[PDB]
RNA sequence: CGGAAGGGCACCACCAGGAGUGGAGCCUGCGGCGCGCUACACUGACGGAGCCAGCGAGACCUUGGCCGAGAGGUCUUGGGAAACUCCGUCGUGCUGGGGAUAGAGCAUUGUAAUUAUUGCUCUUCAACGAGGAAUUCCUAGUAAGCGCAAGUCAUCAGCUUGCGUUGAUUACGUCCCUGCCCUUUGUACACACCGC
């Protein structure tokens, strides 16, 4: 039969591995959004 | 009359809301038939029709006779007469044709020279004539009125449009 | 018309409507006496303004009070506040402003919440 | 000035009226203090 | 154009069960959406 | 003051409609930026100017689990203050925090001690983001790992594509404190997939060669099921975005 | 359905067991008026409710 | 904008900024002429001070803070229709 | 890369308290861990008497009349919660606090009630005698307690969300510890201070 809505994803070691590698890339690059102070 | 007050008003509005005269049909008018046009015919001529008949060099009364397969009677009013008289010297030969004992002059009681208004008043008041023209906006006007025979000039001779008795 | 005033005592959810006029010395809590308040131990608490200021103008003056809303504590505090506000309104309007100032400063000396309301508005740190 | 007139509750008169040796009446100083005296030692 | 009466023929509708006749008049989409517009009108005027 | 706040709410709805028509005009004029060759209003007012202040609040009569959980929320959030809502009402609550002068509110809801709902309101008549949070993993639950560094953290947003996601990243960027240190040694992530944003605290260092992190703090999945223009104490203001559960494409459509 | 709320209904006599309800739970449902919804949670006190 | 000043400032803009239009706007009086009459009778007050001339443009704060003068018959019959008279404040 | 100084902050610190959990039973979320509910009686139990709110308005909810201890059912009619206050009874005994179990009986719903669907009546009267190791959390309408209403796209029904009532002890200081953070170029502008 059919379902009505998206399933809530359960989180696996491989998922958090891919995540933490993406984080490692973004922090090695040091590229991440920050709310920097408005100049002047 | 501030704009944000108007904004609040239209949002409130959406949230809340969520002697005459009728001219008779003529007695001579079956649904689009116009049974009142039988020989002899009674036709009404325009300046454009005159000048284009000169250009295509066709005869006026002989042309409408051969086009309409019977006898026909020509009419011009004082509006189109003064319109020819205003055109004047270059169409003096057109005035010479327009003055003729065989064409019967019809009088009018009008202020100005708008022969369009004159003739469209005539056809809105009579519905017994046949209009013979070449003009485009007036053609669309006599087209949007129903049950009336338009005959235009074009090609080698005249052409009838709305008359059911084409032959 | 009769010299009469109308005030309110307003606690947490308790509203008390008071109607005050010169009278014979009767106090009617919803048609019952002030000797017939409910919790039987806050009878002194509702008695407080009367014995604070004396009984004579209350002999002069008849008051009718009708109360809605609030628990018992809110109710009786709204009642005595309504009493003080109605009496100071009458003794301002129809009686002397000097005497009004006297009873006002005395009631402010003992307990201001009979006059003004206590709004426990919240605060964050 | 015009807007202060139209939006004022209290009276506001006209602002003002719009070579040769000329004297300045209002002094922004006590008029008898030396410039070196008004100068701070740090700033010199 | 090109269609049969056996194709456009008929699509009838069945009724409420004879055992659930205590709660009659089975609701269909048309009665549902009209109930919906009336309830939305009441909701909107309550909002006003 | 009722007249004042009503005038501010009217101007707020007018300004949001103006931002709306200007955004549609921006989509219209996007075609000419290629032919030849922005934060919100209430977050544009105080983007990097003022430090925010957030009040975290329980719904009502909470469990100890919710107590410690909102405590952990405060621990993750700079300039965050606890509130045990006991016999407090919604309107007087929002009005009292408006009286105090406040940036943002986060109030929590649950079922049987299990946190499952989080709503964030912007106090200067700002928008509200309504989330269902489920997959809660608490530091209290896991271990006595110590304490958070509580330095102004670094932010990592992932998979923010639509302008709805742009409004989201604006709101989260502005709820976190302005002007971080370049060497802020704790970093937060914003990991989006399948319309399920999920977050974990991360302290991090760079090695002799690469980088090394530690996941710490909380760990869960939330999902924005609503965004309203007005505040939460409205319950009637115009919804800016509504989730459609009962539709054809519901288990398939992304960003809705 | 034998008990209804705003956007909520309590439905009996569809399953024999709450185990059957849990085998078919979290699921897309619709009804004869055409309208959509979802079966979410079994009722514990009766079996197929 | 700058076109808002080069175009939109009107005699009608300053006229709705005028006081009795604001009274009729906040529905102090049902009609603007009755608002003018209330202005003449001084049954209103504009923040700290009451007023008597209709020829008044009101700053936005005083628009938020304008009302009737105290112990006025008009506000008293307001509280009489609402049946909420509080003679303690000589309302 | 390290050390040192100075300053600030913290119911993850100090300090004063409070309240639970963990002990018994029941419910419920996790694989033996967690969240709640009821008790352990005298500030208590029981019986009369009095009665004070608010949130909530998409064959249904009902004023009244009838009998039946009750549960209940019947005919008609339209589209005011508990805790609380007074009196009385009981009295320190796992006692009358506690109601777990079991039997018996009577009613309603349902084809059918049987494995009591459900309520009521009487009899049976267990554990629990204030909760170790510990645990948490907190500074005012706060904790807490009480009851009321709605389920209004996520999630919820021995459950969530609103609402009212009553209503406190102790701090409101400190970095002494536990940390954690900032500074160690006045840079800036008077006067003063300071001066690797
Ligand atoms: Zn004519």
Curated annotation (Swiss-Prot), chain A:
Cystine crosslinks: none
Give the quaternary structure. Answer: Component of a heterotrimeric complex containing IMP3, IMP4 and MPP10. Interacts with snoRNA U3. Component of the ribosomal small subunit (SSU) processome composed of at least 40 protein subunits and snoRNA U3. Interacts with the SSU processome subunits EMG1, IMP3, IMP4, KRR1, NOC4/UTP19, NOP1, RPS4A, RPS4B, RPS6A, RPS6B, RPS7A, RPS7B, RPS9A, RPS9B, RPS14A, RPS14B, UTP1-UTP18, UTP20-UTP22 and UTP25.
Encoded by which gene?
A: MPP10
Where in the cell?
Nucleus, Nucleolus
The Swiss-Prot or TrEMBL record describes its family as follows: Belongs to the MPP10 family.
Q: Which organism is it from?
A: Saccharomyces cerevisiae (strain ATCC 204508 / S288c) (Baker's yeast)
Boundaries of the shown chain within the full protein: 347 to 386 of 593
Sections of the chain in a coiled coil: none
- Which residue windows are transmembrane per the record? none
What protein is this chain from? U3 small nucleolar RNA-associated protein MPP10
Q: What's this chain's function?
A: Involved in nucleolar processing of pre-18S ribosomal RNA. Required for the early cleavages at sites A0, A1 and A2 during 18S ribosomal pre-RNA processing.
**Superkingdom of the source?**
Eukaryota
UniProtKB/Swiss-Prot annotation, chain B:
Which residues are listed as membrane-spanning? Answer: none
Q: Which UniProt keywords apply?
A: Nucleus, Ribosome biogenesis, rRNA processing
Return one GO MF term: RNA endonuclease activity
Q: What is its main location?
A: nucleus
Gene3D superfamilies hit by this protein = 5'-nuclease (3.40.50.1010)
Q: Which Pfam families does this one have?
A: Fcf1
Q: Which InterPro entries match?
A: Fcf1/Utp23, Fcf1_PIN, PIN-like_dom_sf, PIN_dom
- All residue ranges annotated as the PINc domain in the record: 41-140
Q: What are the GO BP annotations of this UniProt entry?
A: endonucleolytic cleavage in 5'-ETS of tricistronic rRNA transcript (SSU-rRNA, 5.8S rRNA, LSU-rRNA); endonucleolytic cleavage in ITS1 to separate SSU-rRNA from 5.8S rRNA and LSU-rRNA from tricistronic rRNA transcript (SSU-rRNA, 5.8S rRNA, LSU-rRNA); endonucleolytic cleavage to generate mature 5'-end of SSU-rRNA from (SSU-rRNA, 5.8S rRNA, LSU-rRNA); maturation of SSU-rRNA
Entry's family note: Belongs to the UTP23/FCF1 family. FCF1 subfamily.
Subunit structure, interactors included? Interacts with FAF1.
Instruction: Give the function comment from the record.
Output: Essential protein involved in pre-rRNA processing and 40S ribosomal subunit assembly. Required for the early cleavage steps of 35S rRNA at the A(0), A(1), and A(2) sites.
Query: What is this protein identified as?
Result: rRNA-processing protein FCF1
According to its UniProt entry, this protein's organism is Saccharomyces cerevisiae (strain ATCC 204508 / S288c) (Baker's yeast)
Q: Gene encoding it?
A: FCF1
Swiss-Prot record, chain C:
**Residues that span the membrane, as ranges:** none
Q: Which GO terms describe its cellular component?
A: 90S preribosome; cytosol; cytosolic small ribosomal subunit
- What is one process in the GO biological process aspect for this record? translational initiation
Query: Where does the signal sequence lie?
Result: none
Q: Which residues carry this modification: Phosphoserine?
A: 32, 59, 74
The question of whether Phosphoprotein is a record keyword is answered with: yes
Keyword annotations from UniProtKB, A to Z? Acetylation, Cytoplasm, Isopeptide bond, Phosphoprotein, Ribonucleoprotein, Ribosomal protein, Ubl conjugation
- An example molecular function term from Gene Ontology annotations: RNA binding
Disulfide-bonded cysteines: none
PTM-bearing positions, type Phosphothreonine: 68
The primary site where this protein sits is cytoplasm
**Compartments where located:** Cytoplasm
Q: Which Pfam families match?
A: Ribosomal_S9
Q: Crosslinked positions for Glycyl lysine isopeptide (Lys-Gly) (interchain with G-Cter in ubiquitin)?
A: 28, 45, 57
Q: What does this protein do?
A: Component of the ribosome, a large ribonucleoprotein complex responsible for the synthesis of proteins in the cell. The small ribosomal subunit (SSU) binds messenger RNAs (mRNAs) and translates the encoded message by selecting cognate aminoacyl-transfer RNA (tRNA) molecules. The large subunit (LSU) contains the ribosomal catalytic site termed the peptidyl transferase center (PTC), which catalyzes the formation of peptide bonds, thereby polymerizing the amino acids delivered by tRNAs into a polypeptide chain.
The entry sums up its family as follows: Belongs to the universal ribosomal protein uS9 family.
Subunit and partners? Component of the small ribosomal subunit (SSU). Mature yeast ribosomes consist of a small (40S) and a large (60S) subunit. The 40S small subunit contains 1 molecule of ribosomal RNA (18S rRNA) and 33 different proteins (encoded by 57 genes). The large 60S subunit contains 3 rRNA molecules (25S, 5.8S and 5S rRNA) and 46 different proteins (encoded by 81 genes).
Q: What is this protein called?
A: Small ribosomal subunit protein uS9A
UniProtKB/Swiss-Prot annotation, chain E:
User: According to the lineage, what is the superkingdom?
Assistant: Eukaryota
Annotated segments matching region Disordered: 1-21
- Where are the compositionally biased (Basic and acidic residues) regions? 1-8
Where does the signal peptide begin and end?
A: none
Q: Where in or outside the cell?
A: Nucleus, Nucleolus
Self-association or partners: how does it assemble?
Component of the ribosomal small subunit (SSU) processome composed of at least 40 protein subunits and snoRNA U3. Interacts with snoRNA U3. Interacts with EBP2, FAF1, MPP10, RPS16A and RRP14.
Q: What does this protein do?
A: Involved in nucleolar processing of pre-18S ribosomal RNA.
Q: Which family does it belong to?
A: Belongs to the UTP11 family.
Q: What is this protein called?
A: U3 small nucleolar RNA-associated protein 11
Q: Which organism was this protein described from?
A: Saccharomyces cerevisiae (strain ATCC 204508 / S288c)
Identify the coding gene: UTP11
Q: Which residues of the full protein are shown?
A: 3 to 50 of 250
């Amino acid at each position: 039969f059919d379902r009505t809505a998206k399933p809530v994803p359960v989180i696996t070691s491989e998922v958090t591995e891919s995540l933490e590698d993406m984080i490692r890339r973004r922090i090695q690059d040091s590229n991440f959004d920050d709310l920097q102070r408005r100049t002047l | 009359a501030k704009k944000t007050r108007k904004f609040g008003l239209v949002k409130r509005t959406l949230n809340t809301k969520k002697t005459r005269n009728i001219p008779q049909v003529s007695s001579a008018l079956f649904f689009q038939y116009n049974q009142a046009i039988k020989p002899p015919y009674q036709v009404l001529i325009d300046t454009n029709f005159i000048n284009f008949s000169i250009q295509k060099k066709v005869d006026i009364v002989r042309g409408m006779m051969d086009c309409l397969l019977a006898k026909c009677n020509p009419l011009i009013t004082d509006c189109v007469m003064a319109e020819l008289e205003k055109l004047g010297p270059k169409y003096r030969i057109a005035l010479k044709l327009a003055r003729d004992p065989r064409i019967k002059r019809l009088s009018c009681s009008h202020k100005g020279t708008y022969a369009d208004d004159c003739l469209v008043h005539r056809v809105l008041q009579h519905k017994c004539y046949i209009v013979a023209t070449n003009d485009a906006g007036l053609k669309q006007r006599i087209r949007k009125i129903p049950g009336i025979p338009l005959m235009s000039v074009g090609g080698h001779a005249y052409v009838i449009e709305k008359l059911p008795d084409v032959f | 018309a009769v010299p009469s005033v109308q005030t309110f005592g307003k606690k947490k959810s308790a509203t008390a409507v008071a109607h005050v006029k010169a009278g014979k010395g009767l106090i009617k809590v919803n048609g019952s006496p002030i000797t017939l308040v409910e919790p039987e131990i806050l009878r002194f608490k509702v008695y407080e303004p009367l014995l604070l200021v004396g009984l004579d103008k209350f002999s002069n003056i008849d008051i009718r009070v009708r109360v809605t809303g609030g628990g018992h504590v809110s109710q009786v505090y709204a009642i005595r506040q309504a009493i003080a506000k109605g009496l100071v309104a009458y003794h301002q309007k129809y009686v002397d402003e000097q005497s009004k100032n006297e009873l006002k400063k005395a009631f402010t000396s003992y307990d201001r919440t009979l006059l003004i309301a206590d709004s426990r508005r919240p605060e964050p740190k | 000035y015009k807007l202060d007139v139209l939006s004022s509750v209290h009276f506001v008169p006209k602002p003002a009226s719009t070579e040769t040796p000329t004297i300045s009446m209002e002094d922004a100083q006590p008029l008898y203090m030396s410039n070196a005296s008004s100068l701070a030692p740090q700033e010199i | 154009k090109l269609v049969h009466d056996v194709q456009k023929k008929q699509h009838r509708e069945r009724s409420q069960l004879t055992s659930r006749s205590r709660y009659g008049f089975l609701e269909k989409h048309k009665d549902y959406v009209k109930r919906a517009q009336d309830f939305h009108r009441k909701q909107s005027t309550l909002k006003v | 003051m009722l007249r004042r706040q009503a005038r501010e709410r009217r101007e707020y709805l007018y300004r949001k409609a103006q931002e709306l028509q200007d955004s549609q005009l921006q989509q219209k004029r996007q075609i000419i930026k290629q032919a030849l060759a922005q934060v919100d209003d209430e977050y544009a007012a105080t983007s990097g100017i003022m430090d925010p202040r957030i009040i975290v609040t329980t719904s009502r009569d909470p469990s100890t689990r919710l107590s410690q959980f909102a405590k952990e929320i405060k621990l993750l959030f700079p300039n965050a203050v606890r509130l045990n809502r006991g016999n407090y009402v919604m309107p007087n609550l929002v009005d009292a925090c408006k009286k105090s002068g406040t940036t943002d509110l986060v109030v929590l809801h649950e079922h049987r001690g299990v946190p499952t709902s989080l709503t964030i309101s912007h106090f200067p008549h700002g928008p509200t983001a309504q989330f269902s949070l489920h997959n809660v993993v608490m530091r209290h639950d896991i271990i006595n790992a110590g304490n958070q560094s509580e330095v102004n953290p670094h932010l990592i947003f992932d998979n923010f594509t639509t302008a709805l996601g742009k409004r989201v990243v604006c709101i989260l960027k502005h709820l976190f404190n302005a002007g971080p240190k370049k060497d802020s040694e704790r970093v937060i992530t914003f990991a989006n997939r399948g319309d399920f944003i999920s977050v974990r605290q991360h302290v991090y260092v760079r090695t002799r060669e690469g980088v090394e992190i530690a996941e710490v703090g909380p760990r869960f999945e939330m999902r924005l099921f609503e965004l309203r223009l007005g505040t939460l104490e409205n319950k009637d203001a115009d919804v800016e975005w509504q989730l459609r559960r009962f539709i054809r494409t519901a288990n398939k459509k992304d960003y809705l | 359905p034998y008990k209804i709320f705003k956007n909520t209904a309590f439905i009996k006599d569809m399953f024999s067991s709450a185990m059957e309800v849990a085998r078919f739970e979290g699921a897309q449902i619709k009804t004869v008026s055409g309208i959509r919804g979802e079966i979410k949670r079994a009722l514990s006190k009766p079996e197929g409710h | 904008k700058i076109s808002d000043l080069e175009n939109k400032v009107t005699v009608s803009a300053i006229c709705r900024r005028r006081l009795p239009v604001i009274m009729h706007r906040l529905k102090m009086a049902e009609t603007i002429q009755d608002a003018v009459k209330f202005i003449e009778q001084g049954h209103v007050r504009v923040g700290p001070n009451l007023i008597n001339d209709p020829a008044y443009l009101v700053t936005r704060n005083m628009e938020d803070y304008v009302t009737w003068v105290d112990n006025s018959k008009i506000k008293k019959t307001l509280l009489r229709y609402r049946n909420q008279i509080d003679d303690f404040d000589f309302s």
